[PDB]
Scaffold this active site. Structure first.
Site, PDB file in Angstrom:
ATOM      1  CG  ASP A 131      -1.998   1.101   1.090  1.00 43.33           C
ATOM      2  OD1 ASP A 131      -1.853   1.873   0.336  1.00 43.33           O
ATOM      3  OD2 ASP A 131      -2.702   1.060   2.041  1.00 43.33           O
ATOM      4  CB  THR A 132       2.343   3.325  -2.727  1.00 46.67           C
ATOM      5  OG1 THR A 132       1.203   3.445  -3.501  1.00 46.67           O
ATOM      6  CG2 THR A 132       3.024   2.283  -3.312  1.00 46.67           C
ATOM      7  N   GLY A 133       0.173   4.253  -0.403  1.00 41.68           N
ATOM      8  CA  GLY A 133      -0.964   5.343   0.175  1.00 41.68           C
ATOM      9  C   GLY A 133      -0.856   5.382   1.532  1.00 41.68           C
TER      10      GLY A 133
END
Ligand SMILES: [Cl-]
Ligand SMILES: [Cl-]
Ligand SMILES: [Cl-]
Ligand code: NA
Lengths: 5, 99, 99
Positions: C25-27
């Site tokens: 999850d890059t967010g």
């Protein structure tokens, strides 16, 4: 902040 | 480009003629933007995050530029803490995760 | 590997001697795992996202194997609907976004 389905 | 993750992967987007900042988010199925006006009709959608579910407005076939790459697809509008670019539009701009 | 984003980027992790499935999850600033026991000291934290905030336990200096790659860092434990590997551990395995 984390982050949606 | 190649984006590392030491900092939030924030990029400039253009939607409705307006520049905004958004997060590239591989953990998001869908693209979600803060309250703004978009053309056409919308449909209801519920989305879930870390804190629970919210109602958003779903707008289909919206033109959006992401980091200078053109995309046309679904944008959800609602009370998100940050504008998020999700996999529906990350696939349109050819993004991959690599390690 | 190179992970395309047509589907959720789910990988196997090993944490606390347990195998789990988790989302890359890059967010996410932080790594958040469903309720489990971890060794050592912890402190309370609130984390937020779509839908609001949840209370978690913060454990530092935890080792995790992510898709075969070992990393160490802070892990948050609490009632998250999905196990999430956030940027604090994605950096350690050299993950980048590419387009
Ligand atoms: Cl779409
Ligand atoms: Cl850390
Ligand atoms: Cl690096
Ligand atoms: Na510790």
């Amino acid at each position: 902040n984390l982050x949606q389905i | 480009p190649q984006i590392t993750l030491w900092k939030r992967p924030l990029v400039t987007i253009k939607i409705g003629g307006q520049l905004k900042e958004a997060l590239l988010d591989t953990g998001a199925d869908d693209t979600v933007i803060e309250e703004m006006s978009l053309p056409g009709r919308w449909k209801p959608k519920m989305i879930g995050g870390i804190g629970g579910f919210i109602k958003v407005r779903q707008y289909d076939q919206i033109i959006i530029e992401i980091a200078g790459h053109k995309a046309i697809g679904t944008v959800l509008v609602g009370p998100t803490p940050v504008n998020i670019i999700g996999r529906n539009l990350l696939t349109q701009i050819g993004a991959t995760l690599n390690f």
